[PDB]
Design a protein around this ligand. Sequence first.
Ligand code: NAG
Lengths: 79, 136, 167, 112, 488, 292
Amino acid sequence: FMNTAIPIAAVLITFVGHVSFFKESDLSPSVAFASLSLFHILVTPLFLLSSVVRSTVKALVSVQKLSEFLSSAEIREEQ
Amino acid sequence: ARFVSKKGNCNVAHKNIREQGRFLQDVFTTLVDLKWPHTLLIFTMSFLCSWLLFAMVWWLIAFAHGDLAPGEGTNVPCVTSIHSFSSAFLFSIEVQVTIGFGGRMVTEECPLAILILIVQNIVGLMINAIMLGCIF
Amino acid sequence: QDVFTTLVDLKWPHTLLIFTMSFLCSWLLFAMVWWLIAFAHGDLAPGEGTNVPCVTSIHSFSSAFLFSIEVQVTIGFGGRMVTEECPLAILILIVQNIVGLMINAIMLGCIFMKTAQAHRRAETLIFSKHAVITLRHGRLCFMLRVGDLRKSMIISATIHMQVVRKT
Amino acid sequence: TSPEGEVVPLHQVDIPMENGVGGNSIFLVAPLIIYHVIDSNSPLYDLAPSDLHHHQDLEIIVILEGVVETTGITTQARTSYLADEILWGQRFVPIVAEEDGRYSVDYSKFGN
Amino acid sequence: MPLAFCGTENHSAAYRVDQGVLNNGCFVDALNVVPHVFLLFITFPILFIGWHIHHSTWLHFPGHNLRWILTFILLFVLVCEIAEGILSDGVTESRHLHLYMPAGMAFMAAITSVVYYHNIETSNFPKLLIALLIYWTLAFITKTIKFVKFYDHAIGFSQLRFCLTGLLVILYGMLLLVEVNVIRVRRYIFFKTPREVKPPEDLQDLGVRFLQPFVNLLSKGTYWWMNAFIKTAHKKPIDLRAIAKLPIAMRALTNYQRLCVAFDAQARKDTQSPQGARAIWRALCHAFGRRLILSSTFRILADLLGFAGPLCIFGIVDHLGKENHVFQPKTQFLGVYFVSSQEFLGNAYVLAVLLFLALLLQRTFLQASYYVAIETGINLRGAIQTKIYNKIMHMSTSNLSMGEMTAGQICNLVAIDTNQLMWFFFLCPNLWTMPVQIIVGVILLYYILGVSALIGAAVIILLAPVQYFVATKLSQAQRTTLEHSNER
Amino acid sequence: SEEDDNLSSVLHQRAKIPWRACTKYLSSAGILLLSLLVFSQLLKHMVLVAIDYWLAKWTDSALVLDQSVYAMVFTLLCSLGIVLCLVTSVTVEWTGLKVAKRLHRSLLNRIILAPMRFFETTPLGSILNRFSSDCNTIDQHIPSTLECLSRSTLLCVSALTVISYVTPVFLVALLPLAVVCYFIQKYFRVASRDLQQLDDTTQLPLVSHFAETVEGLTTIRAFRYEARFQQKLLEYTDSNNIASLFLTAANRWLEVCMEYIGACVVLIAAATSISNSLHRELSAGLVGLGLT
Ligand SMILES: *[C@@H]1O[C@H](CO)[C@@H](O)[C@H](O)[C@H]1NC(C)=O
């Protein structure tokens, strides 16, 4: 739900707080769709990078154990 | 795991072969092997290719001298009564098919036009003889 | 006959150069004789006519070349035409016409012969570099390895092992 | 394989057409049958019906070489019926019939 | 009203040949047409002829990697040139097709030269491309004629056509350089013994199915080679008969050899920390960092192009918002009009065309970056998997009580730890690009809207910790479910 | 024999089991539950496209010039859309949980009364494998993918309807592009399910091979057959690798085709919209919303 609700809530606040806070800059269809399109593309990297960092920590933890495994007692070769 | 096809078309996956280059003579032999629709298609395209290519140079050589501009009696045109690219195309195809129109002929005072005229006849006979041999 | 067949077996660029030069020489040769007919009747000074010509619009040697290039390859422009009052011009026109329709034809025949001969590609057989002598079926025997390269099949192939010795 | 210490993957052995003259040359304009008589000096000497299955490595090729009278071109017909096609203890039905006008031969009787 | 090459303005007065034949305006445009139409009518019969021993060797002439990207940027500017030409001709009275018909034929010349290259690269025959060589010089010659003609009039950088011509000469020049490169590489037409090269081992091998790493750049980019495979598998199932041995470099044995080289290099560098976590990290970096950085650079380029998307649609809606929406023919030189960048970028038709081309390049480069990252991950696995396998063979089975427990651990390790490491390697390009992507994104919102978009971007970024929080909650929930379902 | 097996495999491959999946969902969720779920999904997408259209029409009037009054309807619609997403998300989770709890109870009550001869005739290992792992997937993965697929499919069809609204002639281009994308999807699905099964069936021996060696370290080292095992390990890993490599490559091709088609839509939509708006005086908001 947060993934689906983040972009709609974000764009609604932007269009609302534009005029009501500082109407010194009149809205226009040009800037409106520009900002809308930018949010539509940028919504996915944000909710994806959260999974990327969660994967990096688990990969770092697992690879650290792998190094400890390689440093274990190995069978000595011939001579 | 078969060796020879039962129908007769014995195919063999000849591999581990050295890099064998192909010259232009083998390309010519493959042109002969093309069937009737393929030969007719490439023949029509090649003749149109030659016709339009010679049309382009004739239109270029007409616009080079100034024949494309309205000649006020003085400027002798390299090709008479050539007005637009369509007219140049008609003149070019007439030379390369030995038709002959007379009205839009070619005259003197333009050695470049003479050189283009002679080379087309030589190249036109060559491609005509090649086309005759291919279909024959 | 021998000197004619020699050119048949020439390579592609040689025959192209020979054919192109032959046509150009034939065209140039007719230009010289056509210019001679001009020099007889049609002078460089036009004189406002005053004499019935037999080759119209032939004002210079270049015009005669245009007449030759139009008549020998059967284009036939109308700006320059042949007329009466010149029996030698009629005679040379018949001679020019017959040699024309023959010179291209004999050149056209070479292309037919060339495309038949050039489709041979006979150097497409693979063999070994040395000889092998070993045992087969229990007895010592000579042997060799053969191969083919063409996509097609060597139909009705016959093989002879011709041993040459000084005995 | 060979008793010398090696093996050949595609070793070829040839059995003649068993013609009355013993030459590999036959004249035919109406379909006819060709029989090769297996003998002691033949690969079929030890041929058993057990090997007549489909998963055997024994291919019999019958190359037909003939030149046409029209354009003098040579024709190369190839055939590779393996032991899966041939069946043991079979024979062909009479392929040719007798008629008043001309001799007739049934072409569909080949598969019978 | 006629339909000739150049307009009939002033009763075709521009068709004059005085004051210099080359100095004429209409003449130089026609000169550029000549080499293009020459290539068209010299290649069509040879191409239709071509349309065992050659289909199993997808060889390549040297420099083809640069040639493919060179022709791509060349066709890019050519279609842009057509758009520039039609914009200038619209304001004029006559049709003036001379501004976009020559470049229209040039675009068809570029595409036919590329397919001729591919059709002639399927077999080792470098002698057939002399037509391309004699075409490129003539194209370069006529391109320089246009450049010097514009300099003699001093149009300048105001008109975009001058800049397009000035870059096309360099583009043609680079084509000449990469073309003559194969001469010194091969020496096939100007020397006695050509230095012929043999196909690689993987291509020459009978059983090979994954030939993507060694294929033409177009196929390597858009996976067009897969068409055949994607169709055949529709009828028959997929088994180990279609799939075959992996390529030589893609096999795990070569990857294992590269890993040992990196380990030996890392050991000789800093043996103070042998078999340490950072040591393995640095070894994997110096081993696979080449393709890793390659995938990252492709993703950076893809992200930059993806930003241009909204940056392009801004112009289209702005141009419609303009009330007058009149043409801008003010700038002109020698009678004929010439568009300017400040109005060429605003024209609606070209902006949509440029967006399509830019989006095509984007949607392609994004896929390349992901594929390289995925390809590196499987290769890293095949290398890391056998590295543990070698350790298993060399390990000592001491502490049987402690060794028994580790048997399940090491089996679980090679199952989940290796898989989780590959996911990091798969997402590593995304991790590298995410900061600059988001940074560029918030910056562009400011320039688009202002302080309003700043607060909007903050609310969007506010959803990142929410995802992190629920991810920890989901992990806790998943552990509880797994613990309960295990006993169940 | 082999031909009949291949024909049966091809028939089973093309069988997407549409009615089977539909009947399972309908029997599990409930007549009232499924109705609420589909209504919530439809309502969420309807208000989503509605607020986008309202943004276009509101900003168009501002440029031609009640701006503060119109902004209130946007906030009202934004809250309604947020509420619709919360309802749809909660419904999808609840439906999956109810489906899982009903499916497990039915399966448990059915297996508990199985005949004694069935237990001896059927392998208990395969029964447990087909019971435990399968219900865990249905419980933990079915709701997430179904909600994502429903959201994606409804979003896609709604977007296409917006293109048709802003450009009536777009249907002339939709028909040749819809069939080609369906054709690619077909040839992908028939080849991707097999490649997923093959990748699983090739990655399992990898874990088995690792398990076998780690158990018999002493006996393998005594046999001194290390060289053969190194080749064996490479062979098993190679089969696994190419599986995971074909899969992604095939996946990439599908994505590439999809995105190329998408770009063609953009062109075929924006181009016509230009010649439509400049001529038919179409508002910039419509073309802007359609292009977005
Ligand atoms: C060309 O046309 C322009 C505009 O009518 C005119 O001013 C100019 O004199 C013309 N030039 C010639 C050479 O006709």
